[PDB]
Symmetry: C6
Subunit: 219 residues, 6 copies
């Protein structure tokens, strides 16, 4: 990663063995459950493109998902090149060359160049741009590897309402979209798919009931 | 988090893999027992709103509780907005814009803006404000996920007094001061078994818990 | 905790996850054996009142003991207030308000105030004062949760003297008092409660025998 | 390794016990799976040739692979010597002698000489040059220890398409761009089972892997 | 402990949770085997008397041994007092009072006084003086808890010579130089079995242990 | 160990508990397999003679090997004294006394003296000299505790060539000597002791075949 030293300088630091192992283990244990995305974002805090590639490369298995990840990265790289065409010319002593999409992804850039972009004034955060592309691709994988659809989450006749809401929002979380779309699913399905006993109790509470109030009434 | 380096400067630091792992494991092992709140508060020491969102996001399962958490955060965010009406105008070179409720919660603010507020002079501690909202919401979850009421904790006829007081105060802690002193000293005696109850009335009012527990050991 | 940086300044540091976990685990594994007190004192090295409350709050179970701990803290807090009545008046720019008993215990003081007291010149060590109260209460719990009394430690007819002395001082350690009282128990009971074979051997050694000499003679 | 301290100076640091243990364990658990190469590259971040030799030396077993590694290193060392003919002469007070192939590999150079080259201005990065040779040799071992050829990866008649693509690209990664794109998009379809193959021809050319995998889920 | 920071200053540092845990575990697993002494000495590197008391206090069980340890410490403390008679008088602004035996042992001295002695110029190393007393007492415990005498270590008629020498020197280490050389070279041969003994007399005096072990492999 | 601080000064640092435990564990798990030597060298990076003695002393068991280690150290210490006779005379304010062999081994020198030698300008690296002697003795133990001789490594009639080469170089590695002697064993035995099918294939490849080429042809 790029961390701050004691002189106000942003300097490169080696990725720690604990960080490497933590990322490998979370993929091993959780596959592509939704909580793997925050794990990846935090473990790649301040990462260079090289560090991001290191983390993705150390993943064992799930190579179909990782290949989909590469395709998403290339799409974002192609879009970046269309939005930032490079301007030919000799690079000045101080400055650094403009980064292409393949430079952000770390395929055509060295670590020294990645450090130069990230520690520049103002910084060009190729690590955060690359991380955005990876997380975009990881969100697609979480979508695809989700076993259940939100329309199939129905409360059982003897299932506690808390367990039903657990399944509802677990399923809703794996279908990543805007909150306007997640609030729409809730207002469309959560009460309507509760079991008959709890459904009649919640409709009397009215639409203005909080989840806390809904869960309290169906205890 | 935002911590002091070895030379007195407030700088941003990445949340450590040990901190992330510790928080994930304690929720996995303890769910929403009362001791999860101090663990969260300590593990989020110096956290930015982004760190707090990271920690809450790494929680697997318990999405009903975590959704209740979002609603509590939105309630506190709305109250913050009502108490701090925004003043329109261009931001001066040095200062930073005043934060809204969604900025404290980290949904409409960048990490750099959060660092700017927290390292400002004087600091706007958006991380501690957000953490206050989260702990408020986590406390609601603990109280709701408490299975037993203090009125149902009664000492068995052959149950050691120590084990009964363990269960009593464990339950009282989950049933989240004016009433916690109310349960103590009078509900505790009333729900003791007849054998220990008779010993405790002889002690008279003003007995410490140590004196109460010593008198009912045998 | 409050640690020293590289400029001679005492600054606040976050309690580490390793420290939190270590304290939780030692309570889980050892309950209130006597060695939990040194574990707590070392793990709370340099702790603020907030850190001390964090450690006590993270304890799962043993809530009867922890409630006795609160009562001991309130007694010491009440005594501190009786010995240090606060003097009303506006606090000067540099100085800090005088700490009440509830401020030392962290119930009416902020972390910022605790840092101010502990890093003041001269420091008011509210963390060490609070720690004294907690350890006082923890010593009472170790006393109460000790299963055996020193008068019941008697050497068996075939029990090795070393195992008997192990039980003797293990029991004596859980009854915390002054060493004058622990030397009294030893001079009153250790030889007198050895089995007949070793007892007759030790009485011939005389009162001036060291424990090493006593254990060597009864091997 | 040679890392920057908290004040901008390039100083030598001892390889940590965690780094040593991590490298030993990953070889123990993963042998020469493709993901062992990124692990080695990251764990040897900033390494001197001595650190690289330490890491390779701590490997227990697999001495046939490790001997192949030595031969690859010697081949690259010989090429370095042919491209950098040595210039005889006394070394000036300030500078350092030019490194031979065996100096980069750490067999004829001391740790102090390696520090001198790596911290020179401009630096002679003997650690990264050596690491390049090692990873080149490790890549040869991975390819040789790959059990299956990409031509033998065919989807079973009842095998889920996801599992088939997992095996396909796992195998393709061990079979170490002009031909890796060649297997993709046409070998992948050709080795699918008749049921999914018929769906994939209807998608037409230009289908992404996401579109291919979505179409053969059921 | 009292360690140097990253800038040359001797400052107090809290004993780490890893150091505490390591010491507790080694006593739990190894009791008072001889290798417990080096572990204690290394784990107490730079320790104050308070740290040393902390480490000894965290030991669970073995209270007979730990009481023998206290008596040894008191013996050394009394000898220190006899060798350093106290000089009455008011302490000057700069200096520190001379330490008694109980001050070195940490029973009558505060942590701040211990820091003052250890960071003084010249330093009064109360931590290393105390540690010397503790290791002296720990050595007495190891010797007392050694089950076997060197005279009872004899090679079996079919026991490999290597295993016999392992047991011989393991026992000799617990039986805590003038006599340790005495057991070596002549007791070692005398307690070998007749088969290896006959080989070792043919080697003649002056044989190294390597030569002795090589000659009795088969 | 002796590490560099932030002022360019080489200062003493305590040996870490992780380093102590790692060395103890590797001896417990690997005994005296050849890879224990690199483990020891890396874990003793920058070690003082005191640290080296600490690591050797913490070894449980294998006391015959450790005694052979002491004898090797004394031989090297005696040779050092013969090559560096000490010159009597008062030590100047700045300088330090010349180290004897027993000073390098840490038996007659204090930690303060070891720090003085190692941080001197120019440094007298007693830690690296001692480490050389220990590794010399450790190499002798790996030799002696090797169960197999290189002449007994013969490929089985159905044994894969890769497994045979694994055994060959594992055995060759435990007999530590110069590479000229290890290249001699390879050119004398590796092809000659392959099974008849692979042996005839390799002899046709000729002596100029690499190991990669030899292993590919006998797959
Ligand atoms: C970098 C990473 C790790 C990230 C992130 C991130 C950023 C902001 C927020 C967030 C914070 C507070 C509030 Cl108040 C809202 C809100 N308020 S609102 C209009 O009412 O919805 N929106 N959002 C999310 C949106 F970005 F829009 F600002 C809020 C979050 C929250 C944090 C959180 C998690 C938690 F567990 C409980 C909380 F209290 C807060 N995380 C999510 O909300 C993810 N989530 N998704 C669903 C879904 F899909 F099931 F509905 C559910 C959840 C959480 C649990 C209930 C259901 N994270 S990242 C991603 O890049 O890797
Ligand atoms: C930030 C977090 C981590 C926090 C906190 C915090 C702050 C102050 C105190 C505290 C300290 C000392 C005393 Cl004297 C009182 C007291 N004195 S009083 C009139 O009698 O009430 N009050 N309180 C708490 C109140 F806020 F009120 F000021 C006291 C605490 C205490 C610390 C503690 C824990 C412990 F284990 C044993 C102790 F000795 C001290 N923690 C609690 O007391 C929690 N607790 N609750 C109940 C209940 F509800 F069952 F009674 C019980 C307990 C503990 C076990 C017995 C029963 N923590 S956090 C979480 O916000 O994230
Ligand atoms: C401080 C410690 C840890 C050390 C060391 C050290 C120093 C240099 C080298 C080294 C580096 C690169 C090349 Cl090119 C050669 C070479 N080139 S050459 C003429 O063709 O032979 N020689 N040597 C070794 C010699 F010192 F001479 F410079 C080379 C080494 C190598 C590192 C290595 C290990 C590995 F696993 C694979 C590699 F690619 C490189 N380690 C060894 O070679 C040990 N080894 N021994 C035998 C034997 F005995 F079976 F043949 C075998 C091996 C390695 C595996 C195959 C067989 N380490 S230490 C010791 O003090 O604790
Ligand atoms: C130093 C070490 C650790 C390294 C490295 C490294 C460098 C660059 C890239 C990389 C990044 C993004 C893209 Cl877009 C491309 C691309 N775009 S392209 C035209 O389609 O090929 N190429 N490459 C790699 C090439 F060098 F070519 F530039 C890309 C990588 C990627 C990182 C990665 C891994 C992942 F898991 C998922 C990702 F999204 C990105 N790693 C690989 O791709 C390895 N890999 N190989 C194959 C193969 F062979 F089976 F196809 C497959 C994979 C990954 C899983 C699918 C199949 N690492 S190292 C080791 O040297 O020590
Ligand atoms: C902060 C914490 C962790 C503390 C402490 C502390 C302070 C001083 C001493 C201490 C040091 C050396 C000597 Cl010479 C004496 C002595 N000399 S004397 C008159 O002859 O008795 N007194 N004391 C104790 C007294 F404070 F008075 F100065 C001595 C201690 C000792 C350390 C120790 C432990 C050990 F294991 C073996 C040792 F060699 C030394 N610890 C104890 O002694 C506790 N202990 N108690 C009993 C009892 F009850 F069974 F007798 C026994 C023991 C130890 C084992 C034998 C029996 N710790 S804390 C608490 O706040 O958490
Ligand atoms: C502070 C602590 C941790 C210590 C220490 C320490 C100091 C010096 C030495 C040492 C170093 C090298 C040599 Cl050459 C001699 C030697 N040369 S000589 C005439 O032959 O005796 N003497 N001694 C030790 C004596 F103090 F005497 F100067 C030597 C040691 C050695 C280190 C060591 C350990 C090892 F495992 C193998 C080695 F190569 C070197 N440790 C011992 O030797 C302990 N030991 N004891 C016996 C006994 F008793 F059974 F013979 C045996 C052993 C080791 C295994 C064989 C038998 N440690 S501490 C604890 O105080 O807390
Ligand atoms: Cl690490
Ligand atoms: Cl890269
Ligand atoms: Cl989830
Ligand atoms: Cl509920
Ligand atoms: Cl820092
Ligand atoms: Cl970490
Ligand atoms: Cl971790
Ligand atoms: Cl955020
Ligand atoms: Cl509880
Ligand atoms: Cl009780
Ligand atoms: Cl930590
Ligand atoms: Cl507090
Ligand atoms: Cl005990
Ligand atoms: Cl005994
Ligand atoms: Cl540093
Ligand atoms: Cl480490
Ligand atoms: Cl480790
Ligand atoms: Cl080397
Ligand atoms: Cl793979
Ligand atoms: Cl799929
Ligand atoms: Cl420091
Ligand atoms: Cl630690
Ligand atoms: Cl720990
Ligand atoms: Cl003390
Ligand atoms: Cl031993
Ligand atoms: Cl042998
Ligand atoms: Cl450590
Ligand atoms: Cl030493
Ligand atoms: Cl090997
Ligand atoms: Cl092969």
């Amino acid at each position: 990663p790029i961390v701050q030293n004691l002189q106000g300088q942003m300097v490169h630091q080696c990725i720690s063995p604990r960080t490497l192992n933590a990322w490998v283990k979370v993929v091993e244990e959780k596959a592509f459950s939704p909580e793997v995305i925050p794990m990846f974002s935090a473990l790649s805090c301040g990462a260079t493109p090289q560090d991001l590639n290191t983390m993705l490369n150390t993943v064992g298995g799930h190579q179909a998902a990782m290949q989909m990840l590469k395709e998403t990265i290339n799409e974002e790289a192609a879009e970046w090149d269309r939005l930032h065409p490079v301007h030919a010319g000799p690079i000045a002593p101080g400055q650094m060359r403009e980064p292409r999409g393949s430079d952000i992804a770390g395929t055509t850039s060295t670590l020294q160049e990645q450090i130069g972009w990230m520690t520049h004034n103002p910084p060009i955060p190729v690590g955060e741009i690359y991380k955005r592309w990876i997380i975009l691709g990881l969100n697609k994988i979480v979508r695809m590897y989700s076993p259940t659809s939100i329309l199939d989450i129905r409360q059982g006749p003897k299932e506690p309402f808390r367990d039903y809401v657990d399944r509802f929002y677990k399923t809703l979380r794996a279908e990543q979209a805007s909150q306007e779309v997640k609030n729409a699913a809730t207002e469309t399905l959560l009460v309507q798919n509760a079991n008959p006993d709890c459904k009649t109790i919640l409709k009397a509470l009215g639409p203005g009931a909080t989840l806390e109030e809904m869960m309290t009434a169906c205890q």
